[PDB]
Amino acid sequence: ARVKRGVIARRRHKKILKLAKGYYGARSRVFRVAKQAVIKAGQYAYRDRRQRKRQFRALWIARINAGARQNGLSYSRLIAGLKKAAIEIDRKVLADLAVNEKAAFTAIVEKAKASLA
Template sequence: MARVKRGVIARARHKKILKQAKGYYGARSRVYRVAFQAVIKAGQYAYRDRRQRKRQFRQLWIARINAAARQNGISYSKFINGLKKPLLKSTVRSWLISQYSTK
């Protein structure tokens, strides 16, 4: 059986990781072993923070809707309950859009 030479494949894999680590500080952008760890950790942070961003935006939207609802003399919970009733959906949605499109 012929000998398998992996030099080209290994170099390509290293280049791919170093390209992903471009812009990192010090050895993290130059040394494969350190760069690999940095890229893996960055991926973990990105995965976690994509979910955190969704949570934070939901908090922000709730706070904004609550503020707008209270300006009109209704609590957030009653407002959301009203949204779930079919007749109000379209009117409330248009009201919400008008509240934040003017700013």
């Protein structure tokens, strides 16, 4: 029973060249280059799921820091001010209140100053 492998080879090639479209020049059309650029673009997508969490945390912090100097503190004395008391608020929703809801942020900052920390 001779089997000829010309039809199940083709389905596995088109499955690679579908994930690798949108690429420059010869990385999106010939297979011995488009197999390397599919594996490499899967390692980057694995590392950058962790680095996504670090690029926003560093963006939330630098927005609280700018907004809390305009009222009269730093960032680092504010976080000790909220944790002298118990307010229990993330960085994600402080940096929303810094931009959009600016009057509610000032009513938070005055309570850290009353906490005197």
